[PDB]
């Protein structure tokens, strides 16, 4: 992947998470489960929807009858007509094929970028209060209940609130 | 108190077998996709602009 998250340091996808494209798995004393980050998912769904509509709706054609009829003494203009139909066929086929090829690659990179930014948003929030244990997972140095978990997902994690407890537990763990 | 509790960042997957092509790779299975190529017709001659044809 272009950004390294999908099929990268996050190795696989979650069939268990069904309500969103990008989300979270959590586990605390209150239990575990999957949840989807609604903001990032809806932003990506809006973006891709706009992309598909842009590809479709920018093609606005008028009423037209492609066919033409020529008699046996009009072979040259008949071939001229064929060249026009063929040239348009070649232009549209090649352009359509490459547009799908190139934009499909951009779409998968887009998802890869969205995952990386989501991981980095959390990592920049938790800082040293949690450990980066790989596969997109953070292991906390302080207890993080459901309310604390939602604050991380909401982008409102209070680092100073838990920094002292995490610091003491981190030093004890490392010692 | 004790440390612990984990949070993980991940992405969706499903049982989809839809394959698309990309500039770098062919037959990449994806979770969702749409078709831009109409390849079906109703097999009938019909009325343009509401008006029937002359047969």
């Amino acid at each position, epitope marked *: 992947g272009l950004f390294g998250a999908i099929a990268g340091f996050i190795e696989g996808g*979650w069939t*268990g998470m069904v309500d969103g494209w990008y989300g979270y*798995h959590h*586990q605390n*004393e209150q*239990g*575990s*489960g*999957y949840a989807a980050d609604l903001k990032s998912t809806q932003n990506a769904i809006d973006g891709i929807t706009n992309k598909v509509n842009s590809v479709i709706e920018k093609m606005n054609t008028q009423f037209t009858a492609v066919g033409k009829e020529f008699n046996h003494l009009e072979k040259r203009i008949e071939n001229l007509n064929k060249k026009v139909d063929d040239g348009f066929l070649d232009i549209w086929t090649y352009n359509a094929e490459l547009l799908v090829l190139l934009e499909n690659e951009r779409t998968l990179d887009y998802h890869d970028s969205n995952v990386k930014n989501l991981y980095e948003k959390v990592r920049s929030q938790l800082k040293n209060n949690a*450990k980066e*244990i*790989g*596969n997109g*997972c953070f*292991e*906390f*140095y302080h207890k993080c209940d459901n309310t604390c978990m939602e604050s991380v997902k909401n982008g409102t994690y209070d680092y100073p609130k838990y920094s002292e407890e995490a610091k003491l*537990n981190r030093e004890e*763990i490392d010692s | 108190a*004790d*440390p*612990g*509790d*984990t949070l*993980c960042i*991940g992405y969706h997957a499903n049982n989809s077998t839809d394959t698309v092509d990309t500039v770098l790779e062919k037959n990449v299975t994806v979770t969702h996709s749409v078709n831009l190529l109409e390849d079906k017709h109703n097999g009938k001659l019909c009325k343009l602009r509401g008006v029937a044809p002359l047969h």
Partner: antibody, heavy 124, light 109 residues
Framework: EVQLLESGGGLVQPGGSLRLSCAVS????????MNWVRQAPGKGLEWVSH????????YYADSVKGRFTISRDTSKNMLYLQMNSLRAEDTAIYYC?????????????????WGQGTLVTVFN | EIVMTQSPATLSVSPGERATLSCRAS??????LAWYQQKPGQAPRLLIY???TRATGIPPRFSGSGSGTEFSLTISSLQSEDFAVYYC??????????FGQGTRLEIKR
């Protein structure tokens, strides 16, 4: 082969303390999370405690919170269970269970290998 | 806590026959369900993980199925070694990890 050996069980009065040891051999200890599961005499199974491969995360059953403590020494291939404030209802056979998977938190909670267990009796 | 109910408590059927076990959950646990076997005097052994995948060394005669709240375990040809107690356990919302009360398979004579 993978071997899990329990020890440290025995008789004790209520309010006493015991410490279990799970001897680990046959796999990379650091890669896998460990658990304690107990079974009352002639009864069903009951999960007790869990510790992650790293050791930072621990989870406990509600009835043993504040009394039991799970720990590991990865360099020595050892898993421990320190029980304080023991109760008569804690009388059971205690097994240490290895998690069947490594590096997938969302797919943990499955025990592929169990030791034969050790017995803790707390009568009065 | 996800309560696990495992009926019938005791099931009677002859060797070589087929036995169906049921596991019910108070809440959906998706496919994060396991099955365990415990012969008398021995530690529990893992049979099924993911509610349908057999573990290493599990012979093909053991079948697992289900999702959500209703689950089942099937032994196609029942041999005398398999007359034991079977437990079901969820790992979809824990802690706590919860087991069912188990089912005893008795030989019919």
């Amino acid at each position: 082969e993978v071997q899990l050996l329990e020890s440290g069980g025995g008789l004790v009065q209520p309010g006493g303390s015991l410490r279990l040891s799970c001897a680990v051999s046959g796999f990379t200890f650091s890669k896998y999370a460990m658990n304690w599961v107990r079974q009352a005499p002639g009864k069903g199974l009951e999960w007790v405690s869990h510790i992650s491969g790293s050791g930072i995360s621990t989870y406990y059953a509600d009835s043993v919170k504040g009394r039991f403590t799970i720990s590991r020494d990865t360099s020595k291939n050892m898993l421990y269970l320190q029980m304080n404030s023991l109760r008569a209802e804690d009388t059971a056979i205690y097994y240490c269970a290895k998690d069947a998977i490594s590096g997938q938190i969302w797919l943990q909670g499955t025990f592929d290998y169990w030791g034969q267990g050790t017995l803790v009796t707390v009568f009065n | 806590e996800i309560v696990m109910t495992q009926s019938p408590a005791t099931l009677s059927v002859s060797p070589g026959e087929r036995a169906t076990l049921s596991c019910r959950a108070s809440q959906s646990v998706s496919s994060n369900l396991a099955w365990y076997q415990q012969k008398p005097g021995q530690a529990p052994r893992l049979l099924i993980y993911g509610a349908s995948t057999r573990a290493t060394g599990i012979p093909p005669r053991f079948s697992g199925s289900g999702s959500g709240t209703e689950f089942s375990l099937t032994i196609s040809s029942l041999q005398s070694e398999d007359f034991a107690v079977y437990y079901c356990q969820q790992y979809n919302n824990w802690p706590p990890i919860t087991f069912g009360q188990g089912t005893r398979l008795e030989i019919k004579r």
